[PDB]
């Protein structure tokens, strides 16, 4: 992919330039600002497509693209993704890769899920404050959960309406097309932006060793989680429901997992994994003809885990402890973000700002995660492919009523 | 109505549970919070449909559903409703059921009617402040009058456009359908919410007697106003315009008023009141074929009076004196709220938050009003039916040009 | 034009009433407030159509109404308008008609061009603050550049889509029609509003001589700029590109410039200037059949210059020095405002609030500018007509590939 290769070239460049300036001399604060600036603009542009993207995606999907076995597949996907995101959260909290009022927080979480006002939720959200007299107060920051929730309601309502809602459906389809064009164009400007951010981040970092160590630890944490979710959770769930050998199930797909790593894209891995389940496992083409394609765009357990660990890592590196609700916000958004990062084209950096915007984090340290995304990409892709295959086996096993 | 009966069952339950907990022991503040919480969410959900509801209703109505006699009917309706709402206001201020800078307030009222910005008006509104240097400042709280006003302008503008605006009209029709589905679904969750609110309200109340006394006084105040508007104002206006016996006019409709109480629904009272004016009064089927049906969804004088007295009662119980503008805001919103509470299905609790949101009141004490709405419902229904009948007589009398 | 004559009659009236009250006695502050009040409402109404107008105009234009020679015409127009607006800015700063952190300001300018959030930008915008620790902070005031920019992106994206975006295009066309009806209706209420504002402004002014002197100086400044742009810049550019006699080019059009002054409307001047270039200069009817009509609604160099000098004059009279970014905001909005004041019907007062809202100025002193707009209108009209003629010559000269 020209842009993936372009983004990595930009990273290297950005990195080399930052290193050169640092070893050359201590850069003036105003000049570091001007150095990282074209990265600020990359974020500002992407972050300004989040809201329209959330609204069009939710309403275009839940209406436009809505049997029993289909229900089974969706249940497996959502369940596995929530599992993956929760694993991510536990590991990033335990491992703590990033190195720097209980009921009330969850109470606010639940309030922010029903924003008193749609508009205001687009930029701010409710918080509890202690005065020992508690109050609600606004705090800046878009209510991602507030809006996602209400638009889910709205989309499910329209969807039920039927051809009566045709017009509004078509309008929102057009909107989604326009916003996706803009995301594509911005991600084309991304390589420069990422280069500038990395060059700036290096010039600011006080001890390369510490930051290098933290980022490496984050990568291992993402790695560990991909292994546990795919190597243990997926296979165990297979057995618990199928009572069959997960290794026997996995033995056949070896070619499929290989294509997964090889193509680094479920889309390109898709025809091989058709073959591997139809021929080797002998899964009914029906189940194979639905679970595989649907999963290729929504079942992204590896993506969700990466997105949760990354969000708490950025939190941690910024000396910010997330409250119980903020952690639930990460888990909820991480799952949605992965079903998006999978559907929306070149939306890898959009979704990560969505999760960070949702927890109210800096959103600048997103640059470090990019510097290493290219290594973690292979694994996370393969994890997503594996899950879809297990799902097809599970759906087929749970579909013997026939 | 399963839901009306459900809501009353919920009230009783809520009440019994609150009473039990109170007589059992003093509940911890955090636990009372968790008790009333599912009521907080009922409000948060309803209040989040106000804005879309205001926009779709105004634009779908003033465009989609827009002779001389028709003009006459609308004039009578709007006039009588404003009269009913003003009577409500005077009585609630005089009686004062709830028991706890002149020009500037009306000046702000007039400003808030033309919000400098549509978006900002969706969550905040202009106020005057004294520094002896006066200034305008924002104060949180959706500009209900700001938005209603501008959308009235917008809808009247589209309406005139004609079939040219077809598309935009159809789009907003679909929106209105979706938002009404959501209001219906939430009001289904209402019974639990109302029960929780009442249980909490009882646990907090310090002296049951005082609150019981206040709520009873509010009910009598609503009652008195229904009597004065229907028993005096309506009949007097009939004579002043018709110069005929209002008792002679009322004598025939007795059956109609009975059905009104019996069906507790103008809709179910509708065929009887057709009969009562066509047969007994001998009103021309033409006038009867328009005034009755149009009124059955817009002429709600009893509803407007209830909605104004309730709004100032909630104000009063909360030790808040309304300024001259806030009182005008209640009168204006109360009239619109009654034409809505009449059109929008199961919108009894939505409209009351609209009036409270408009005056910027607590919006939680709405629970007490629900506890007694079921008693006042009968009377207010009959008052609305009576007004429509008088209107048909007045329109027919004012339509002898023919 | 009944309304132009009405607006001037209102000015005279307003002025006479203000003068009478002032010579009669010192008016009470509350009564001056009530005097100017119906002007406040004129602004509040107009300013509340800016946002919808910006959105519908940008999306209806850049999509609905989008060869080489056509590209040439647009380049000439945009270039000449930016030149005109910059001349305006320099002159108003130099002459200083109105009589009362470098990089950071431009950095904010560039940020406000990519608002992190669409909604929030509709009412507020980013600023740098010094604590010696710099921060970004919100400051009230709609991000005109933020929204214009993003909608330009959105419209260009839809435009490319093609007939696929038909629906959304038609929807926004309808919206634009509705908003334009409202602007027309408000400008009908303008005469009273302007009269009230002028009556109030006179009653407040402490020294008529000083204010009279300042306004006269502003008029000369607008005059000087119209002369320099039309008398020097336009003709020079003609020669630089054509290497032909600008006087020989101008000699023929004399009749065209006359109609310009005579009709005080490029629209009415349009058939004469067709004649003057086709017959006298002998410009190919093709170029004449495009450059003239397109320019008659977008090439408004005289309008842009007026709008920049006016914006900085209102700034200056209000003892407000504009930062480097605010000046660029004026130049950018002034150009857009002139292409609008030209397209949108009776949008002379809307566009001036847009420029003032963009720089965050009082927006009330707009009354003085109206008091003298009628004199400056003749000249600015003729300047716009002249530019279109020069453009036709330049486009024809640059189009001899043929
Ligand atoms: C010195 C300061 C430097 C500051 C940072 C960089 C500033 C420049 C950014 C830039 O040009 O962005 C490149 C980007 C990407 O363009 P690109 O040319 O770099 O890559 C895409 C190219 N194609 C389409 C051929 C594949 O411009 C865009 O197209 C952005 C689209 C989204 C817009 C969202 C709102 C923000 C922009 C508002 C202004 C609109 C202008 C029109 C844009 C075109 C739309 C179709
Ligand atoms: C412990 C804390 C308790 C806190 C309070 C209760 C929280 C639960 C509230 C709840 O479930 O609401 C019931 C309500 C009502 O559902 P219901 O099942 O109770 O009643 C309606 C049922 N039918 C349709 C069959 C007649 O859910 C809704 O449908 C709400 C619709 C409006 C949504 C507006 C935004 C708020 C919700 C955002 C989240 C979206 C989820 C999808 C909802 C379905 C939409 C079609
Ligand atoms: C004492 C205090 C005085 C305060 C200032 C004046 C207040 C009155 C202003 C006024 O009436 O405006 C006249 C204006 C202009 O009406 P007009 O009658 O003066 O001039 C236009 C007349 N025709 C159409 C025949 C050419 O009313 C409008 O039509 C305004 C349209 C834009 C609305 C934007 C939002 C603000 C208004 C919200 C309220 C809506 C009411 C309906 C308006 C009609 C819409 C089709
Ligand atoms: C036979 O197969 C049938 C199948 C049916 C598909 O149904 C759709 C239902 C909604 C769903 C799951 C779909 C696609 C995009 C999904 C969205 C991506 C967006 O991303 C987010 C997060 C990140 C933001 C940047 C944007 O918004 C979410 C809120 C948004 C999202 C998760 C909302 C839900 C959407 C699929 C067809 O599948 C193609
Ligand atoms: C022959 O008969 C012809 C007749 C013509 C009807 O014309 C329509 C004109 C607008 C009007 C009066 C109508 C219905 C809903 C009315 C709305 C209910 C909403 O409620 C509110 C307040 C409460 C909020 C929760 C929502 O918004 C208002 C702002 C909204 C409202 C009052 C705006 C005005 C609307 C009727 C047909 O009648 C069916
Ligand atoms: C053969 O001829 C072809 C030609 C093609 C025309 O293409 C269109 C492209 C967009 C353009 C330049 C056009 C008309 C209105 C223009 C708008 C007026 C508005 O005014 C503003 C400022 C003032 C505000 C009050 C409203 O918004 C701008 C943001 C808005 C504006 C400048 C955005 C750009 C628009 C012409 C046809 O021409 C008729
Ligand atoms: C100010 C910017 C444009 C300077 C250049 C920065 C680099 C990193 C970026 C920014 C915009 C990018 C281009 C924008 C879009 C395209 C079209 C696509 O089909 C191939 C890649 C190509 C041609 C990109 C190559 C790299 C690019 C030039
Ligand atoms: C958490 C909630 C759901 C617990 C139950 C609370 C009670 C008061 C409410 C909430 C939702 C309600 C249900 C939602 C919708 C319907 C469908 C309708 O056609 C009949 C009533 C029925 C079946 C309602 C009965 C009462 C109900 C169960
Ligand atoms: C409160 C207002 C209405 C008082 C009058 C103020 C004056 C200055 C204004 C306000 C509204 C204006 C009218 C509104 C619209 C029209 C219709 C148009 O085809 C001719 C002019 C005419 C008839 C205007 C004449 C002047 C007018 C009466």
Q: How far apart are CA C322 and CA C316, in angstroms?
A: 9
The beta-strand segments (E) located in A41-123 are none
Q: Annotated binding residue at C284?
A: no
Q: Looking at residue C63, what DSSP letter applies?
A: I
Q: Does residue A122 sit in helix, strand or coil?
A: coil
Cβ atoms of residues C288 and C274 within 8 Å: yes
Q: Mention every residue, 6+ apart, whose C-beta is less than 8 A from residue C38.
A: C192, C193, C196
DSSP C37-62: HHHHHHHHHHHHHHHHHHHHHHHIII
Contact B23, B201 (CB under 8 A): no
Q: Which residue has the tokens 């001389």?
A: B68
* Nearest CB to A122; choose among C110, C117, C154: C117
Beta bridge partners of C366: none
Strands A124-130 and A134-140: antiparallel
Residue of the CA atom closest to atom 3 of ligand 3: C38
Q: How far apart, in Å, are the Cα atoms of B263 and each of B222, B257, B258?
A: 20, 10, 8
- Chain B residues in contact with A161 by the CB 8 A cut-off are 174, 177-178, 181
Instruction: Name the residue with tokens 């950018």.
Output: C332
Tokens standing for A73?
């597949």
Residue C166 tokens read as 């038909």
Hey, which chains touch B, using 3+ CB pairs under 8 Å? A, C
Closest ligand to residue B2's CA: 8
Count of A–C CB contacts within 8 Å? 64
Q: Is B227 left (phi over 0), alpha (psi -120 to 50) or beta?
A: alpha
Q: ∠ CA A53-A57-A60 to the nearest 5 degrees? A: 135
Tokens of B85: 């709402």
C227 touches chain A (CB under 8 A): no
What are the backbone angles phi and psi of residue B231, rounded to the nearest 5°?
-85, -20
* Positive or negative: CA dihedral B386, B296, B298, B314: positive
- The single residue listed with the structure tokens 């290989």 is A258
Grouping H, G, I as helix, E, B as strand and the rest as coil, residue B128 is strand
Angle (deg, nearest 10), helices B166-204 and C166-204:
70
B348 is in an annotated binding site: yes
Residue the block writes with tokens 């990195």? A15
Residues C74 and C155: their CA atoms lie apart, in Å, by: 17
- Taking the Cβ of residue B37 and every Cβ of chain A, the question of whether any pair is shorter than 8 Å is answered with yes
CB within 8 Å: A171 and B171: yes
In contact, C352 and C50? CB cutoff 8 Å? no
Nearest partner of A183 among A399, A3, A383, judged by Cα: A3
Give the CA count within 13 Å in the CB-facing half-sphere of B391.
35
Check CB contact of A189 with chain C, cutoff 8 Å.
Answer: no
B157: nearest Cα among C190, C185, C55: C185
DSSP code for A127: E
Tell me the three state secondary structure of residue B126.
Answer: strand
Nearest CB among A142, A167, A182 relative to C153 is that of A182
Helix extents (H) in A246-300: 246-263, 266-275, 285-298
Distance from CA of A233 to the nearest CA of C (A): 39
Q: Which two tokens stand for residue B21?
A: 């907990």
Method: cryo-EM
Among residues C2, C21, C7, which one has the least CA distance to residue C367?
A: C7
Residues A16-52 as b or e (16 or more Cβ within 10 Å = b): ebbeebbeeeebeeeebbebbbbbbbbbbbbbbbbbb
Nearest of B263, B290, B346, B244 to residue B3 by alpha carbon: B346
Torsion of CA B240, B243, B247, B252, to 10 degrees: -120
Q: Within 10 A of C159 (CB to CB), how many other CB atoms are there?
A: 18
- C364 touching chain B per CB within 8 A: no
> Do A144 and A54 form a contact (C-beta atoms < 8 A)?
yes
- Alpha carbon distance B300, B125 (integer Å): 29
How far is CA A20 from each of CA A17, A32, B183, C51, rounded to the nearest angstrom? Answer: 5, 13, 61, 47
Residue linked to tokens 């009351």 = B352
Ligand 7 lining (C-beta closer than 6 Å): A 2, 6, 10, 188-189, 191-192
Cβ contact B152:B336 at 8 Å: no
Question: Residue A94: in which H helix or E strand, if any?
Answer: helix A68-95
Buried/exposed code over B268-302 (b: 16+ C-beta within 10 A; e: otherwise): ebbebbbebbbeebebbeebbebbbbbbbebbbbb
What's the CA-to-centroid distance between B366 and ligand 8, angstroms? Answer: 21
To 10 degrees, the CA torsion angle through A142, A143, A144, A147?
A: -120
> In a 10 Å sphere around its CB, with 0-12 CB exposed, 13-18 middle and 19+ buried, how is residue B212 labelled?
exposed
Rounded-to-integer distance, Cα B236 and Cα A90, Å: 75
What are the phi and psi torsion angles at A142 (to 5°)?
-60, 140
Of all helices (H) and strands (E), which one includes residue A379? helix A366-398
Asked if residues C254 and C277 have their Cβ atoms less than 8 Å apart, the reply is: no
Q: Nearest to residue C172, comparing CAs of C281, C62, C69?
A: C62
β partners of residue C138: C126
Question: What tokens does C114 get?
Answer: 């990519």
Q: What is the phi-psi region of residue C321: left when phi exceeds 0, alpha when psi lies from -120 to 50, beta otherwise?
A: beta
Indicate the burial class of B372 (C-beta count within 10 angstroms; 0-12, 13-18, 19 or more). middle
Neighbours of C50 (CB within 10 A): 23
């Amino acid at each position: 992919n020209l842009l993936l290769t372009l983004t990595v070239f930009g990273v290297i460049l950005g990195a080399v330039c930052g290193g050169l300036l640092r070893l050359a001399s201590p850069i003036h604060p105003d000049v570091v600002m001007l150095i990282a600036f074209p990265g600020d603009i990359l974020m500002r542009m992407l972050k300004m497509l989040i809201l329209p993207l959330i609204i069009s995606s939710l309403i275009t999907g839940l209406s436009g693209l809505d049997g029993r076995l289909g229900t089974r597949a969706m249940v497996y996907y959502m369940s596995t993704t929530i599992i993956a995101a929760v694993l991510g959260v536990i590991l990033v909290l335990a491992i703590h890769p990033g190195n720097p009022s209980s009921l009330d927080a969850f109470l606010d979480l639940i309030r922010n899920l029903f924003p008193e006002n749609l508009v205001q939720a687009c930029f701010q959200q409710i918080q509890t404050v202690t005065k020992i007299k508690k109050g609600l107060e606004f705090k800046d920051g878009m209510n991602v959960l507030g809006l996602i929730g209400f638009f889910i309601a709205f989309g499910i309502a329209m969807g039920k309406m039927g051809d009566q809602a045709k017009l509004m459906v078509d309008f929102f389809n057009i909107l989604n097309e326009i916003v996706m064009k803009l995301v594509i164009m911005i991600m084309w400007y991304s390589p420069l932006g990422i280069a500038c951010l990395i060059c700036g981040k290096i010039i600011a970092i006080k001890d390369l060793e510490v930051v290098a160590r933290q980022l490496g630890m984050y990568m291992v944490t993402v790695i560990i989680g991909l292994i546990i979710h795919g190597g243990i959770f997926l296979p165990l769930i297979y057995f618990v429901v199928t009572r069959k050998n997960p290794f026997s199930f996995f033995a056949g797909i070896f070619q499929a997992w290989i294509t997964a790593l090889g193509t680094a894209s479920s889309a390109g891995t898709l025809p091989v994994t058709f073959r591997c389940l139809e021929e080797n496992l002998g899964i009914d083409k029906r189940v194979t003809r639905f679970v595989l394609p649907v999963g290729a765009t929504i079942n992204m357990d590896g993506t969700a885990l990466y997105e949760a660990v990354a969000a708490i890592f950025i939190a941690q590196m910024n000396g910010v402890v997330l409250d119980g609700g903020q952690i639930v916000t990460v888990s909820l958004t991480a799952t949605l973000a992965s079903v998006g990062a999978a559907s929306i084209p070149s939306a890898g950096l959009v979704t990560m700002l969505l999760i960070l915007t949702a927890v109210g984090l800096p959103t600048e340290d997103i640059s470090l995660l990019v510097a290493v995304d290219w290594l973690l990409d292979r694994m996370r892709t393969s994890v997503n492919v594996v899950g879809d295959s297990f799902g097809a086996g599970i759906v087929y096993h749970l579909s013997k009523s026939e």
